[PDB]
Amino acid sequence: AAQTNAPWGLARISSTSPGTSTYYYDESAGQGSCVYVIDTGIEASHPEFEGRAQMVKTYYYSSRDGNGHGTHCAGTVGSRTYGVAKKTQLFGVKVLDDNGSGQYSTIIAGMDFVASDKNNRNCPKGVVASLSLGGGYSSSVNSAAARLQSSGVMVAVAAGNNNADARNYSPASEPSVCTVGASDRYDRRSSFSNYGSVLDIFGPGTDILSTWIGGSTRSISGTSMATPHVAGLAAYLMTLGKTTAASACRYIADTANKGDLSNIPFGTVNLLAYNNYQA
Numbered sequence: 414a415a416q417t418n419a420p421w422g423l424a425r426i427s428s429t430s431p432g433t434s435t436y437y438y439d440e441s442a443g444q445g446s447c448v449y450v451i452d453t454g455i456e457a458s459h460p461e462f463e464g465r466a467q468m469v470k471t472y473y474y475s476s477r478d479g480n481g482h483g484t485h486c487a488g489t490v491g492s493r494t495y496g497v498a499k500k501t502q503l504f505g506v507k508v509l510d511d512n513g514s515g516q517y518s519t520i521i522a523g524m525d526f527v528a529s530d531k532n533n534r535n536c537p538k539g540v541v542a543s544l545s546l547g548g549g550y551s552s553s554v555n556s557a558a559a560r561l562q563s564s565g566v567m568v569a570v571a572a573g574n575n576n577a578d579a580r581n582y583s584p585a586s587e588p589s590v591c592t593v594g595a596s597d598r599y600d601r602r603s604s605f606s607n608y609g610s611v612l613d614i615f616g617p618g619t620d621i622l623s624t625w626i627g628g629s630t631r632s633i634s635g636t637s638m639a640t641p642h643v644a645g646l647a648a649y650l651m652t653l654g655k656t657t658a659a660s661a662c663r664y665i666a667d668t669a670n671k672g673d674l675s676n677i678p679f680g681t682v683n684l685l686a687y688n689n690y691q692a
């Protein structure tokens with residue numbers, strides 16, 4: 414399949430080169446997979462989700478996304494126009510309030526929730542969780558992310574926007590999950606992206622157009638926007654049978670475009686997420 418005039422990041426993830434504008438992907442499009450977006454919520458009624466989104470949990474007085482961040486991330490996973498995996502099922506877990514804040518105890522509970530809740534959902538091709546959130550190092554946050562992964566979910570987490578080594582942030586620093594850095598449309602590391610040995614992969618993160626609340630769209634930047642490209646990629650590859658939840662981060666690194674990014678510090682991987690789709 415080909416989507417013309419796609420967001421640059423979708424075109425990037427199906428290309429060996431920067432500077433193209435068509436997204437190429439197998440038509441299976443993540444059908445029969447599931448992706449949990451653990452964030453400020455998802456506006457499930459947005460036409461871009463086509464009835465494939467729902468809220469499954471909140472820790473606040475509403476499950477509505479009163480921020481937009483979670484809706485944007487969900488859209489990069491799985492919206493019809495803006496998404497990597499255009500037929501995946503999306504499940505929202507609102508651990509962040511409408512200011513985008515959340516206590517670590519709530520975030521942990523939401524990760525444990527997903528590990529159980531997958532057993533209540535139909536995801537024959539596998540399960541992914543996208544965590545576009547983080548704060549300072551916490552062994553308890555990292556352990557929650559490790560349990561989610563161990564339970565059979567492909568966990569993708571943002572590296573963070575501090576232009577610093579991700580070893581000092583959680584859940585970015587957890588070794589067993591897939592930690593995602595950000596790039597821009599000229600294959601530079603994004604100015605804000607964290608780096609370090611704990612990174613596994615980079616994805617498009619500067620000037621990413623996706624869904625927003627009120628049935629809208631906008632472009633924003635962050636490791637939070639790189640993470641759902643990887644999460645959606647994982648769902649897409651699992652639907653194809655090419656990998657599993659336990660092996661997908663390694664598969665994505667194995668199959669990534671290598672050596673193409675600039676301003677990568679010595680000791681950080683130079684790997685850009687790529688679907689290797691041959692039309």
Ligand SMILES: [Ca+2]
Nearest residue numbers: 587588590592
């Ligand atoms: Ca990691």
